[PDB]
Amino acid sequence: SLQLQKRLAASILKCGRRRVWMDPNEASDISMANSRFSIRKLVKDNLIIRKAVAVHSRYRVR
Amino acid sequence: SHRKFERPRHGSLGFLPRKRCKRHRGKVKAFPKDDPSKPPHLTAFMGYKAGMTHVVRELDKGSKLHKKEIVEAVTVVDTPPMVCVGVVGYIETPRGLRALVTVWAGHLSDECKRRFYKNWYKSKRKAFTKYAKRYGDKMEAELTRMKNYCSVIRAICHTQPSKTPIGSKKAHVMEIQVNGGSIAEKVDFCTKMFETAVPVKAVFTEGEMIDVIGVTKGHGVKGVVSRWGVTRLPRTHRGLRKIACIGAWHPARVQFQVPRHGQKGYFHREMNKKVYRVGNGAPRNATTESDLTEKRITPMGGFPHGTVNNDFLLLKGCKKRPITFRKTLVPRTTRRALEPVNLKFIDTSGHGRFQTSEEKAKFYGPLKS
Amino acid sequence: VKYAKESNENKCCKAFGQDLRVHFKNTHATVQAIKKDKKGNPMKLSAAKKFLEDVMEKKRCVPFRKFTGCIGRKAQAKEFKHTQGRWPVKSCKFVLDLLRNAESNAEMKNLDVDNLVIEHIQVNRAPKGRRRTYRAHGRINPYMSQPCHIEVILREQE
Amino acid sequence: SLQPVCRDYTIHLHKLIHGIQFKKRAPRALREIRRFAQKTMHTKDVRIDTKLNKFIWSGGIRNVPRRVRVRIARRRNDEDSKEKFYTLVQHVPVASFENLKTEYVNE
Amino acid sequence: IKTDMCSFSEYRIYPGRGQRFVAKDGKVHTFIHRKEASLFRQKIKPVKLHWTLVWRRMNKKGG
RNA sequence: GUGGUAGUAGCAAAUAUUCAAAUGAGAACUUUGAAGACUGAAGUGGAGAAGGGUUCCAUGUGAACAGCAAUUGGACAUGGG
RNA sequence: AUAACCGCAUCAGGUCUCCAAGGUUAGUAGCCUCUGGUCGAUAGAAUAAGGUAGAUAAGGGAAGUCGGCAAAAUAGAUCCG
Incomplete structure (x- = not known):
């Protein structure tokens, strides 16, 4: 599992769990990161990223 | 207690039990009786069902439809x-x-030889190989038996389903009885047919009642209602596509x-179906006398489930079934039977408009490539 | 641990399964297929491996002779002159694992693994397992496992 | 005596997934594509790419596409799990399906 | 042989086919097919359907 | 205490899963990605009370338990809060 | 709380309070969506009878039945009446 990391990322990214993204090819490095301090460094590297929210236009309404 | 309102029975007890039979072609049963008087002829045939289409003919019956133009399926x-192929003697014993x-x-x-194997592709195909060298070295020992003894004689014939557009090849073997006179001349009739194709015009004619044998098209396990023709129960706990009361208490047993x-x-x-x-x-x-336009009895786009480019026969089971026909057990004359047939128009058109494919091409004209 | 039989050994080897979590009635069926060939002779071990691997693929099948009600009729059981049959996969796994161990025991005693023959396989019932099934109206009903014991004894032919 | 082969097909999916339930169309697409590849190239292990999966599910699970082009590569198997070949199946992006036969694919 | 024609679509009806709706006054409207009849129920006319031989004729197509 | 019934009744409400890679003795079921769905703010969302009492958190695992499976777990064990 | 409470159980049941987005609309109705949440409910193959729920039926229109039971038909808004 990673599990802990998607939980802890979601607190520090201030985003819904649905939103958090974790890099598939660095599943070795992310599983090392247990702490909050460790997951902050993975945000700087961009292995853990926040997804943009789903597109919801007002064009057709207007 | 008695019934209340005395209705007739659901279904016949004549046909029972209602179970799938052990045979894919119709076995004949009961050939017609021998007149030592006629010449020797075959009394049956085999053919494959195709599809049915309507035809127009002029009635010759004082009905109100006398001299009028009736469509018929x-x-x-x-x-x-x-x-x-063969020939078979039959002794009459007390058994x-x-x-x-x-x-x-x-x-x-x-x-013919495919019939004798269940796996043709494997086998070395030995059937009638010892017999063929025995034949060249023929059987006028064993034909003399059939002339001396034997009341009944039957030609073994077989089909040609490579010529049909079924994917078959296998070919049904079939006994057909010979009804004419003199037990010697029945064998001389059979002997001279050996390795000769018998056509349909040898057996049957235009305007003739034929008794049609076959197997009905399967529906699997069906319930009381469809199977026996029974009243549907009213809108009933448990369910309503079924009988309510099987039986009275006694006999303590289902009848x-x-x-x-x-x-x-x-x-x-069936019996009495006119050719x-x-x-x-x-x-x-x-093509007939009336319409005078060049046609084959294939409709456009085939018979669905295809072609036909052989001898056929029209007349008044599932598709691709082997029917057998029979010559009727007594030659009967009912006015309805012994009728002048006159065909004006045979249909060779999902929902077809046009009779022929060149007629379609005329209507739509130069289409786009 | 207490076998039912006992070749003076030297020429024979054995393996035991103490209490496997499988169905007894399904293992009973596999074991009756393995025990002999179509003739009366005892079956070779190379044949019974080649059988049990094919039953997992569902290409050969196991005939259910004793415990029949209500097993569906398959064409693969024509092999055994018997209409009913079935492909018990988890049962074939534990029996393959035991014969795997029985050939391993033969390798210490140094005889031909290629010539081995199944002298005696037998299944016993084992002590029951307890569970609860809940019924309507507050009733509680037992749900129970039936693990089984599997003996195997092999030997050389000739 | 099999050897590694790559070749191309088009699968009539409308034909495969006929009379089948509306919440099993897109799953029972990919079972029958797996069984097709498995039967065609005689191989147990059949990997299928995510861009084939993606195309099939574009429909939404009931409105599956009528035709797909698909090329199917049997290839040599690391220390092998039993069988020493694996099949693998890929989407081919194609504008129209008008006379495209079961062709070979050169490397 | 002789071939009466459809009221709606102006096609030909070879015998053993179609259907003759008799109206309230008693104009015998012949049809080929259920396509024709069930648009005569709805009272959509031949002139507005493009496939029909009537719209064909009036908009410089055919003949 | 143990049978026959019987490898039988049955495991069918709450729209739904699929593909790949990683982990592992073992993957329809664990995790990560990519697609596809549902809930549709008098929500299956975010917080309290009653009632529960360590179920919270981490690391580890031979059974049993989680009506298939299980590398998972409100299970089991050792710590912490 | 469709698994930490109570119903013998990880039981389609029950249990007080707060916050409450967009589109359609009179509307916290129904229908679709964003944030947040979830895919937890044993699977695969065939598509018999009989069921469970859901649809549709030419002509006739309660003749069915203890009885129009069930299902159809009507439905919003504006103007007239």
Whole structure:
């Protein structure tokens, strides 16, 4: 599992769990990161990223 | 207590039990009786069911439809010529009939020979190979038996389903009885047919009642309602596509006359169905006196489930079934039978407008490539 | 641990399964297929491996002779002159694992693994397992496992 | 005596997934594509790319596409799990399906 | 042989086919097919359907 | 205490899963990605009370338990809060 | 709380309070969506009878039945009446 990391990322990214993204090819490095301090460094590297929210236009309404 | 309102029975007890029969072609049962008087002729045939289409003919009956133009539904049956092979004597014993000796031909095709194997692709195909060298070294020992003894004689014929557009090849073997005079001349009739194709015009004619044998089209396990024709129960706990009361208390047993759930279709089963047209595969089959336009009795886009380019016969089971026909057990004259047939128009048009494909091309004109 | 039989050894080897979590009635069926060939002779071990691997593929099948009600009729059981049959996969796994161990025991005693023959396989019932099934109206009903014991004894032919 | 082969097909999916339930169309697409590849190239292990999966599910699970082009590569198997070949199946992006036969694919 | 024609679509009806709706006054409207009849129920006319031989004729197509 | 019934009744409400890679003795079921769905703010969302009492958190695992499976777990064990 | 409470259980049941987005609309109705949440409910193959729920039926229109039971038909808004 990673599990802990998607939980802890979601607190520090201030985003819904649905939103958090974790890099598939660095599943070795992310599983090392247990702490909050460790997951902050993975945000700087961009292995853990926040997804943009789903597109919801007002064009057709207007 | 008695019934209340005395209705008739659901279904006949004549046909029972209602179970799929052990045979894919119709077995004949009961050939017609011998007149030592007629010349020797065959009394049956085999053919494949195709599809049915309507035809227009002028009635010759004082009905109100005298001299009027009636449409009628009509089945095409594909009948390529049945090749005679063998011949079979039959002693009459007090037990029953009993086969004395089967004689066979010299040279059977691979069409006939497939019948004797369940796996043709594996086998070294040995059937009638010891017999063929024995034949060249023929059987006028064993034919002398059939002339001396034996009240009844039957030609073994077989089909040619490579010529049909079924993917078959296997070919049904079939006994057909010979009804004419003199037990010697029945064998001389059979002997000279060996490795000769018997066509359909040898047997049957335009304007003739034929008794049609076959197997009904299967529906699997169907319930009481469809299977026996029973009243549907009113809108009933548990369910309503079923009988309510099987039986009275006594007898303390379910009777065989009560209808149950089970098999429907694939039953071996008619009589007096008139032949309208004997045809030829060799153009203008569907052409008549009236219309005078060049046609084959294939409709456009085939018979659905295809072609037919053989001899056929029209007349008044599922598609691709082997029907057998029979010559009627007494030659009967009912005005309805012994009728002048006159075909004005045979239809060769999902929902077809046009009779021929060149007629369609005229209507739509130069289409876009 | 207490076998039912006991070749003076030297020429024979054995393996035991103490209490496997499988169905007894399904293992009973596999073991009756393995025990002999179509003739009366005892079956070779190379044949019974090649059988049990094919039953997992569902190409050969196991005939259910004793415990029949209500097993569906398959064409693959024509092999055994018997209409009913079935492909018990988890049962074939534990029996393959035991014969795997029985050939391993033969390799210490140094005889031909290629010539080995199944002298005696037998299944016993084992002590029951307890569970609860809940019924309507507050009733509680037992749900129970039926693990089984599997003996195997092999030997050389000739 | 099999050897590694790559070749191309088009699968009539409308034909495969006929009379089948509306919440099993897109799953029972990919079972029958797996069984097709498995039967065609005689191989147990059949990997199928995510861009084939993606195309099939574009429909939404009931409105599956009528035709797909698909090329199917049997290839040599690391220390092998039993069988020493694996099949693998890929989407081919194609504008129209008008006379495209079961062709070979050169490397 | 002789071939009466459809009221709606102006096609030909070879015999053993179609259907003759008799109206309230008693104009015998012949049809080929259920396509024709069930648009005569709805009272959509031949002139507005493009496939029909009537719209064909009036907009410089055919003949 | 143990049978026959019987490898039988049955495991069918709450729209739904699929493909790949990683982990592992073992993957329809664990995790990560990519697609596709549902809930549709008087929500299956975010917080309290009653009632529960360590179920919270981490690391580890031979059974049993989680009506298939299980590398998972409100299970089991050792710590912490 | 469709698994930490109570119903013998990880039981389609029950249990007080707060916050409450967009489109359609009179509307916290129904229908679709964004944030947040979830895919937890044993699977695969065939498509018999009989069921469970859901649809549709030419002509006739309660003749069915203890009885129009069930299902159809009507439905919003504006103007007239």
